[PDB]
Amino acid sequence: DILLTQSPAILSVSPGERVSFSCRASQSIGTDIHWYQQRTNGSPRLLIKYASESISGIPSRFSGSGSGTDFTLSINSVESEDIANYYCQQSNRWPFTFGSGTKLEI
Amino acid sequence: DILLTQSPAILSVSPGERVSFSCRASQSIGTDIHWYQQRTNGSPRLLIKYASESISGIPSRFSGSGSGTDFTLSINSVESEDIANYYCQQSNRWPFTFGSGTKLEI
């Protein structure tokens, strides 16, 4: 089963700064990684699919990059509504698995 | 994306000595590595292509070697005009990427 490492677990950034969440896969998974945002007591929200594809309704502020084992989710210009837990998820190999999560902090 | 590590970043050598720049790829890329020389305020210059192929106009002093992940650019007999930054670049996988550069010092 594919292990998704998200380190660091907490990210402290100042408003308007760029920010990058790391997601590393235990083996090569192409671009088969997706990113969810979950705020305090909300359900997860698909942000980015297939490592870089936009989702309608998500601020252009969000982008993704990577292929193979090393994946990055990025926020140009952070703001308060971006405080949340950020999770990655792979669909390359059964079973689907999730990274452990990275909390964004301003 | 393929990471190209060039270490050490600076190389100090005496005139006429042999010198070897290392370029290591984060995954196997065949012989799909190319080498550029950039002197102070000049643009990069193709030196070696496909890890070992000569470029017309480049002193025979220059050669390349390696395949897989570990690549070496070599200068028999270093001289002053060889002071420069030396970069490697891969074309195995999209996107093309560059190594971080190794400065030659005499």
Added chain:
Amino acid sequence: SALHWRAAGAATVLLVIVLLAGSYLAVLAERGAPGAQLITYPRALWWSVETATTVGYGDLYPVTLWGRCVAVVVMVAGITSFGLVTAALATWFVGREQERRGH
């Protein structure tokens, strides 16, 4: 419309149906097997095509009994349809050559 062109057309349509059903059935067979990659529909469709043509890229294959069985049907449907087209072309060539001779 002569038999061989009808068969060639029928085979083609049939192969497309085998490809689609195979992509669906492969995903249903392979999910639940750890390490399986043949588990989303778009890439299963690509896989069923590379299986029917036997093009052999090796980027995707089944690991379960039923996905392999599905793969065999797709191989055979592919190889067979393409063979039928050859047989249809040969019937054309052999007939057009009778005519060139008078007969």
Added chain:
Amino acid sequence: SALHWRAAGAATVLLVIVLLAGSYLAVLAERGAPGAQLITYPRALWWSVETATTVGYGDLYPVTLWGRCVAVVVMVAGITSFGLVTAALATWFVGREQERRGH
């Protein structure tokens, strides 16, 4: 020149054209997809040949929708051309055998 030898020749020339256009179109489809290897022309040409013959080395394959579509055309053009040659050889053999019998 009989139909089947003209067709075989036409198919061959057509396949060469499909190979060249496919090498070009694959590179245009695959650049921009992270991890794609099918992104320089010489090796794309090699790839389009190994695709048309279905030789299955698995050293290169497309990862995008349009590169896979291009790959399907190349597979089908290859398999089909080779089948046509078989049909042309069979028309030859069947005719040369009529003659051996008198007819």
Added chain:
Amino acid sequence: QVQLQQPGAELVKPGASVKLSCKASGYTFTSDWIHWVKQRPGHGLEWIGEIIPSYGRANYNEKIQKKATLTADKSSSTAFMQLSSLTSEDSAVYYCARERGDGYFAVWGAGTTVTVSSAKTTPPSVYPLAPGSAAQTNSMVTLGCLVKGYFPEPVTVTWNSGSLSSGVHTFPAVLQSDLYTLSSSVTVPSSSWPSETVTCNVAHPASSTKVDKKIVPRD
């Protein structure tokens, strides 16, 4: 050759935009890609993006903030890179390079120095540097000229229209109060001066100026 021609310099106010050109010459094929590469002062090479002009399809480095938009004019064999909403982070040399679809960059442009600043463009002042009356000379003599108060970078200093390359240092500029200053040193046989004329030519692309200054003995 010169196969890829780029403007030497562009000055951009923060928040604004600039369209860099790259005119191609030599052999052009339908299969050619033109790439663009960013080099921030003292740092490495960064791939920005690529265009195939004979189709207009462009791809980009998705790992960085997307500032660039690539286009090409088949008519004029010119590739353009539109850099938008720039900050100081976007100040760099931007090279274009040509790739024959076989993976490497055979030829590059001289690069375009982009400076993101609010400071006025300022052509340099150029002054002689000739020895004082009490300096004795060896068999060589060192002359120079001082390139003061210009913005933005760069300037290109030659001597006698390029014909005098041996014995020449041009120093990196220093920046004070939003203007650059450098000097350039030239050493010729003490015998040959002033009997043989010595002139520095200072070109400042950002102001489209190129000026000469002869170095004659103090009178």
